[PDB]
Amino acid sequence: HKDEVALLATVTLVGVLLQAYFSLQVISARRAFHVSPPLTSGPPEFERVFRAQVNCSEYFPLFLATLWVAGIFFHEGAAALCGLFYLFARLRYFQGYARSAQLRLTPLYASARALWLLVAMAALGLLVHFLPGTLRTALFRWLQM
Amino acid sequence: HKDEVALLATVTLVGVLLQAYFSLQVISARRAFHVSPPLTSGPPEFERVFRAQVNCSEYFPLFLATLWVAGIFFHEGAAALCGLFYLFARLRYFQGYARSAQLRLTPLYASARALWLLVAMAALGLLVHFLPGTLRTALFRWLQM
Amino acid sequence: HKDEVALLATVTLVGVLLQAYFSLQVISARRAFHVSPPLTSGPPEFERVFRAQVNCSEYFPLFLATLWVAGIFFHEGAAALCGLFYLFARLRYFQGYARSAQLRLTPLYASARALWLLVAMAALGLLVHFLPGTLRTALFRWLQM
Numbered sequence: 372h373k374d375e376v377a378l379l380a381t382v383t384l385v386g387v388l389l390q391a392y393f394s395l396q397v398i399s400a401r402r403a404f405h406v407s408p409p410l411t412s413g414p415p416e417f418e419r420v421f422r423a424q425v426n427c428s429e430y431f432p433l434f435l436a437t438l439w440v441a442g443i444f445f446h447e448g449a450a451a452l453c454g455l456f457y458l459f460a461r462l463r464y465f466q467g468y469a470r471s472a473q474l475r476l477t478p479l480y481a482s483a484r485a486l487w488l489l490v491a492m493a494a495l496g497l498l499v500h501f502l503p504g505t506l507r508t509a510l511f512r513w514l515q516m
Numbered sequence: 517h518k519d520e521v522a523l524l525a526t527v528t529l530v531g532v533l534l535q536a537y538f539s540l541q542v543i544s545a546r547r548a549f550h551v552s553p554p555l556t557s558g559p560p561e562f563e564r565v566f567r568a569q570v571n572c573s574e575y576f577p578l579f580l581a582t583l584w585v586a587g588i589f590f591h592e593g594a595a596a597l598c599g600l601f602y603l604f605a606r607l608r609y610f611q612g613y614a615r616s617a618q619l620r621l622t623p624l625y626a627s628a629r630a631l632w633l634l635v636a637m638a639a640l641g642l643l644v645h646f647l648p649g650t651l652r653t654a655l656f657r658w659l660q661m
Numbered sequence: 662h663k664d665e666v667a668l669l670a671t672v673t674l675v676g677v678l679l680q681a682y683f684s685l686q687v688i689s690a691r692r693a694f695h696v697s698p699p700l701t702s703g704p705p706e707f708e709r710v711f712r713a714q715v716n717c718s719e720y721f722p723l724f725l726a727t728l729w730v731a732g733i734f735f736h737e738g739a740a741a742l743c744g745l746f747y748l749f750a751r752l753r754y755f756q757g758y759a760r761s762a763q764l765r766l767t768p769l770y771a772s773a774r775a776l777w778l779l780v781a782m783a784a785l786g787l788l789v790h791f792l793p794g795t796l797r798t799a800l801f802r803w804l805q806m
């Protein structure tokens with residue numbers, strides 16, 4: 372059963388490593404700009420970097436959720452594929468944000484498309500599962516007669 | 517195997533869509549009040565809305581975790597049920613918070629109950645799994661004699 | 662099938678309870694220091710406590726992700742084990758942070774080690790799955806001849 376989900380599990384792990392990467396970058400910025408815990412404020416370089424990490428942090432469970440559902444109800448390989456561009460896009464997102472607020476927009480857009488795609492796949496997959504059983508029973512009630 | 521978890525998978529997806537909804541509302545508020553990234557501060561309308569989104573964002577993995585465990589160790593349908601009120605409650609939470617800080621309290625309470633219920637189900641489910649095997653072995657050691 | 666994952670499911674639940682614990686501590690601090698929603702700023706006691714909760718909140722999906730992958734591709738018991746010290750460490754993290762910023766460092770370190778271990782297990786597990794099938798096919802292409 373490990374076989375049907377190993378790609379999903381592996382994209383999942385690369386996502387964890389990437390978030391961990393983002394976290395260490397934040398400690399790197401905290402030192403570089405004299406910003407010690409708590410306090411999430413400082414020079415805009417630091418704020419831009421804290422902010423990038425946080426953003427990816429809240430999108431991260433959305434990503435995992437849809438990746439798993441799309442991967443299981445639609446198609447594992449395609450889901451893992453979207454998985455990668457998403458993650459790759461979030462890597463470009465973080466590095467862009469770090470340099471400029473504007474330079475973050477292109478991979479944000481890239482990352483959203485990928486994430487929307489996952490959602491669509493999950494949506495389609497769930498539809499195929501539930502929709503035949505339902506139309507069938509809609510028809511049986513009206514048969515009947 | 518998709519059959520035993522499709523309800524859980526579908527509540528999961530509706531949760532993702534809802535969070536996505538919250539996110540777009542925040543971009544909507546960022547534009548409406550001249551608040552550009554980084555910066556999470558501004559008029560209290562904006563702050564109330566940023567705050568609502570964030571809150572739901574951190575409760576979101578708690579929700580998914582318990583939903584899955586309750587859904588698998590207790591009963592899928594009931595879990596998905598709690599799933600819905602929770603999500604429905606978090607939707608009322610966000611829309612209340614957006615208008616007023618006080619108007620957020622009623623669906624927060626509603627959302628907590630639902631979330632507590634999931635936890636209880638998960639708890640009961642895990643108990644049934646582990647508890648017979650344990651009492652049995654407690655008894656065997658004392659048999660013995 | 663509940664049997665192969667009940668330990669993972671149970672560490673998962675204890676993690677949820679712990680986060681819930683962190684959340685109630687924050688409401689406890691909000692009242693204690695006159696800090697009402699929104700606003701995440703206040704005396705450093707409050708800020709230290711808000712901050713602790715937030716931190717654990719973003720590490721929480723990393724934890725769940727790796728716990729599940731390590732638990733399924735490497736070994737369930739060991740994964741659950743790391744699960745506990747991690748959670749136990751994050752409990753010490755939160756209580757330390759609450760008292761002092763410096764007093765948070767030791768269980769942060771403890772929690773990171775545990776989390777790194779999970780990642781390693783997940784990594785090793787995924788390697789064993791994918792790596793034989795690959796070396797085999799690398800060899801077949803060069804056979805051939």
Ligand SMILES: CCCCCCSC[C@H](NC(=O)CC[C@H]([NH3+])C(=O)O)C(=O)NCC(=O)O
Binds near residue numbers: 394
């Ligand atoms: C998979 C292992 C992950 C890496 C382990 C060590 S990195 C530190 C880890 N992550 C962060 O701090 C990230 C940024 C955090 N949001 C912040 O503002 O400091 C942490 O708990 N920091 C707490 C703190 O210093 O405030």
Ligand SMILES: CCCCCCSC[C@H](NC(=O)CC[C@H]([NH3+])C(=O)O)C(=O)NCC(=O)O
Binds near residue numbers: 433486487539
């Ligand atoms: C399923 C697809 C989800 C939707 C895709 C596009 S919406 C933007 C997306 N979400 C948010 O910004 C939400 C609020 C965020 N917390 C903030 O402060 O701006 C993002 O990454 N924003 C980054 C930013 O602009 O700061």
Ligand SMILES: CCCCCCSC[C@H](NC(=O)CC[C@H]([NH3+])C(=O)O)C(=O)NCC(=O)O
Binds near residue numbers: 624631684
């Ligand atoms: C498993 C059940 C969990 C517990 C239910 C009730 S506790 C309140 C719950 N958690 C928190 O507030 C935690 C801290 C939050 N980050 C904050 O700044 O207030 C919430 O939604 N608070 C919203 C708010 O008051 O701002």
Ligand code: NI
Binds near residue numbers: 372517662
């Ligand atoms: Ni099976």
